[PDB]
Design an enzyme around this catalytic site. Structure first.
Site, short mmCIF file in Angstrom:
data_model
loop_
_atom_site.label_atom_id
_atom_site.label_comp_id
_atom_site.label_asym_id
_atom_site.label_seq_id
_atom_site.Cartn_x
_atom_site.Cartn_y
_atom_site.Cartn_z
N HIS A 72 0.88 -1.16 0.00
CA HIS A 72 0.00 0.00 0.00
C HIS A 72 0.92 1.20 0.00
CE1 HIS A 72 -3.57 -2.19 1.16
NE2 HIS A 72 -3.07 -2.56 2.33
N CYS B 57 -4.39 4.89 -2.79
CA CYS B 57 -3.28 3.94 -2.80
C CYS B 57 -3.04 3.62 -4.26
CB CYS B 57 -3.63 2.65 -2.04
SG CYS B 57 -2.40 1.31 -2.12
N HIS C 22 -3.90 -0.02 -5.57
CA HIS C 22 -5.29 -0.42 -5.40
C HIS C 22 -6.26 0.67 -5.68
CE1 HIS C 22 -3.20 -3.22 -2.39
NE2 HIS C 22 -3.44 -3.90 -3.50
N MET D 258 -9.56 1.74 -3.41
CA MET D 258 -8.89 2.13 -2.17
C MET D 258 -8.49 3.60 -2.17
SD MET D 258 -5.80 0.23 -0.07
CE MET D 258 -4.99 1.05 1.44
CU LIG Z 1 -3.32 -0.48 -1.38
#
Ligand SMILES: [Cu+2]
Ligand SMILES: [Cl-]
Length: 99
Positions: free
Chosen positions: A37, A84, A87, A92
């Site tokens: 992340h 992120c 993602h 996200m």
């Molecule tokens: Cu992530």
């Protein structure tokens, strides 16, 4: 305040995803699950005068390890939309209000 990166249930989410923090208060984003992340602020979704390059992790930097976190201190008042990189397409993303 602390925001968890990824739910234990597999969700690629910021927990909390929509929250508020007072100007000058720090935000520590800690890996929880689903990493790598990273935390990147949208240049077009942050208060006037804020340098996205200063408050964001590089798109190429990833919190690859379990105990890793990313701390940022926001001062200019307003809402900031961050995400992120890996993602982003999975939903996200998050929002923080600096009051
Ligand atoms: Cu992530
Ligand atoms: Cl700045």
């Amino acid at each position: 305040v602390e925001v968890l990166l990824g739910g234990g249930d597999g969700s690629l989410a910021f927990l909390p995803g929509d929250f508020s923090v007072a100007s000058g208060e720090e935000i520590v984003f800690c890996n929880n699950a689903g990493f790598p992340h990273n935390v990147v602020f949208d240049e077009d979704e942050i208060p006037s005068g804020v340098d996205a390059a200063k408050i964001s992790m590089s798109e190429e930097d990833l919190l690859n390890a379990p105990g890793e976190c990313y701390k940022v201190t926001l001062t200019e008042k307003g809402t900031y939309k961050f995400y992120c990189s890996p993602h982003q397409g999975a939903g996200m993303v998050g929002k923080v209000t600096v009051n």
